[PDB]
Amino acid sequence: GMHIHILGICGTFMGSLALLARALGHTVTGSDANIYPPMSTQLEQAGVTIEEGYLIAHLQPAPDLVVVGNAMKRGMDVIEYMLDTGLRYTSGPQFLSEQVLQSRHVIAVAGTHGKTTTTTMLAWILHYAGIDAGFLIGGVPLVNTTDTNLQQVFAHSSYLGTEKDDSDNSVNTGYFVIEADEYDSAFFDKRSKFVHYRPRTAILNNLEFDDLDAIQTQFHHMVRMIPSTGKIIMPAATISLEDTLAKGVWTPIWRTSVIDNSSDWQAELISADGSQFTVSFNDNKEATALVNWSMSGLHNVNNALVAIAAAYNIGVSVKTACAALSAFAGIKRRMELIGDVNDILVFDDFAHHPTAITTTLDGAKKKLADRRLWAIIEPRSNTMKMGIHQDSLAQSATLADHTLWYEPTGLEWGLKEVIDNATIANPSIGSQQVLSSVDDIIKHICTHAKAGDAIVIMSNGGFEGIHQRLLTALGNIVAI
């Protein structure tokens, strides 16, 4: 039971590590510039102690280990103190790899689009099927049933799950579902998650652009390590993915196809909108069933098919997996309406990178018709760039009427420049500004938004508690 201190602990990824660490029995403290919900509340309930600011005093007394988030850099007092005093430190992904993943059969999902859709669907299938899989993913499914076990499992976007059972062979457990992405390296360990994580089942969800080689290289770093007895699951007929494998692969492939190096798994559409389809696996005549769900779109069918195949790889029948997805209620923080104040609609969405922001805003425009649309975005900060041109963030917000981006004071990372440079170079990407205070963003909205408008808040986490702070402010405006 070590004492672990986490720098940046209120953010989704690092907070997830804190929660997993507590579940392991560790004592967990942390620092963040702000303490904000929903993660603060989850941390507090788990018995984590959070302190405000990045202060040397937070590392007194000395913890056994410091887990360092991506925003930390040299020149910061707490970091210079850490290095001078010789405290032990590690990155988030290395900590997770050593403390949780090493002992599990890890299922990692990579892709340019829809990674969290696929991981939420997969984690749902596993738990529906009675497999007590751990996970650290980008969101959670909505749980509409009165099943209090599924309610508790999906209370957080992290869950430890159980270890492979040493005595009872009837139990199928010891798994961990995770997203492979370009985030959460640290200043002293620039290895990506594609290098850190060692999945035995890997999904390559897709590989497309709304630097191909940079993305293929990163995917390759994960593919090239999978054991010979593992499985790679990906869509068929996708040259960008076939070329990824061609760099070096030692593991059997299952290829997936949605029909309306040939495929092993097929989803045949019954309803053109993707709300109903049959799933079949070529090597098992019984491995066929129907999905009849409240989701739609070809991307969601593709996501379902790779999730079903991955679950089949670890024992879930096609029948059970398809029953699970037929019961899938959707995903929290996917254009989720959280307020309607003075006729201003407020939505919450987990999009935090260009392809996700694009998809969310496409959906928002289809939904909201002619309403004036405000995008309020905290993109997920990162010291590294992967495949996406600098202009990608600004381009992704083209469909909004107004966009307010957030870059935090003291942890600036070049956002204002990438946006401002993009809007000069391509005026068609419209009206966008980068602000340095959540208070200024809220004031801007309260000041300029009017009855009929819609606001879409986008962040991988709590965005310094902007959600309730905005709803409160909007409800306090004195009408004329």
Numbering used by the authors: 0 to 209, 216 to 265, 285 to 504
What wording appears in the published article?
Recycling of the bacterial cell wall is believed to account for ∼30–60% of peptidoglycan synthesis in Gram-negative bacteria. The Mpl protein is used to link the breakdown component, the tripeptide L-Ala-γ-D-Glu-meso-A2pm (and also tetra- and pentapeptides), to UDP-MurNAc. Mpl and MurC-F enzymes have three domains that are classified in Pfam families, PF01225 (Mur ligase catalytic domain), PF08245 (Mur ligase middle domain) and PF02875 (Mur ligase glutamate binding/C-terminal domain).
The crystal structure of PaMpl was determined by Multi-wavelength Anomalous Diffraction (MAD) phasing to a resolution of 1.65 Å. PaMpl is present as a monomer in the crystal asymmetric unit. The final model includes Gly0 (a remnant from cleavage of the expression and purification tag); residues 1–209, 216–265, and 285–504 of the protein (the full-length protein contains 505 residues); and 588 water molecules. PaMpl can be divided into 3 distinct domains: the N-terminal UDP-MurNAc-binding domain (ND, residues 1–102), the middle ATP-binding domain (MD, residues 103–357) and the C-terminal tripeptide-binding domain (CD, residues 358–505). The CD is a six-stranded, mainly parallel β-sheet (β16–β21) flanked on one side by α-helices H14-H16 and 310-helix H17, and on the other by H18–H19. A loop (residues 404–414) from CD in PaMpl is folded into part of the ATP and UDP-MurNAc binding site. Structure analyses indicate that the orientation of the CD domain of PaMpl relative to the other domains is flexible and changes on substrate binding.
